């Protein structure tokens, strides 16, 4: 009976981009520098997959194409860290980062010379997802909210419509909570905890972005970044500084 009557959540479940494979030359290395280059390459594909996904989100493309760009350039690292976190959580009993089914960074590689400082932040979101026992539906909504978690200081060119969409998904997340088990007092606490998690993503994004920017501009290191991703980065580094970025927060805490 139901299934044949689409729900916002059931639709979020089907547009979820499928799992990408790394390509390989699987004898996977020890050089911290190769790992990064390799991950940057896969990252480029991973981001394109995400853009397509954004366009499939109900109401997203009904925004000025300019806002669709600002959004994706402000939240890509976020969508990336959150999805990697979830995939790492559902993948194993613990300890690792699962970038692809054919590309995994385990305890060993995770601690090579310059890896841990970069990876610890990625492990963080994975541990958080585990700690709060987040359901697949909760995650589908939270990830959508992450796309809508940073607007320009000076608003958007579709502000009104944006505000309406953001709220639609916030309520959509509320439902996924009501569904996961069935309490009443916990629903409040639960919503407080997940909105807290969403709020902490800005922080992990901030840490991951420093390494991303530092590494991209060095040229004393010479770490490769794919073409499109490179563009988004060169494009955002100037703005991310000046404070032209506004982070929506559920808690001024």
């Amino acid at each position: 009976l139901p299934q044949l009557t689409p729900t916002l959540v059931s639709l979020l479940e089907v547009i979820e981009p499928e799992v990408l494979y790394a390509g390989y030359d699987s004898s996977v290395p020890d050089s911290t520098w190769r790992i990064m280059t390799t991950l940057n390459m896969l990252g480029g594909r991973q981001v394109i997959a995400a853009v397509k996904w954004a366009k499939a989100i109900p109401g997203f493309r009904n925004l000025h194409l300019d806002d669709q760009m600002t959004l994706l350039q402000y939240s890509w690292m976020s969508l990336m860290a959150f999805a990697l976190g979830w995939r790492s959580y559902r993948q194993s009993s613990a300890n690792l980062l699962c970038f692809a089914p054919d590309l995994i960074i385990n305890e060993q590689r995770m601690t090579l010379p310059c890896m841990y400082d970069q990876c610890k932040h990625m492990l963080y979101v994975s541990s958080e997802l585990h700690r709060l026992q987040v359901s697949y539906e909760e995650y589908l909504c939270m990830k959508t909210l992450l796309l809508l978690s940073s607007v320009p200081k000076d608003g958007l060119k579709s502000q009104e419509l944006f505000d309406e969409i953001r709220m639609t998904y916030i309520k959509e997340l509320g439902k996924a909570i009501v569904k996961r088990e069935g309490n009443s007092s916990q629903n409040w606490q639960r919503f407080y905890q997940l909105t807290k998690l969403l709020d902490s993503m800005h922080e992990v994004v901030e840490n991951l972005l420093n390494y991303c920017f530092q590494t991209f501009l060095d040229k004393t290191m010479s770490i490769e970044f794919p073409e499109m991703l490179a563009e988004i980065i060169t494009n955002q580094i100037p703005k991310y500084s000046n404070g032209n970025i506004k982070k929506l927060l559920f808690h001024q805490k």
Partner: peptide, 11 residues
């Protein structure tokens, strides 16, 4: 022009 991202948002 092209702007890889912009171009995909219209692909």
């Amino acid at each position: 022009q092209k702007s890889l991202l912009q171009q995909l948002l219209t692909e």
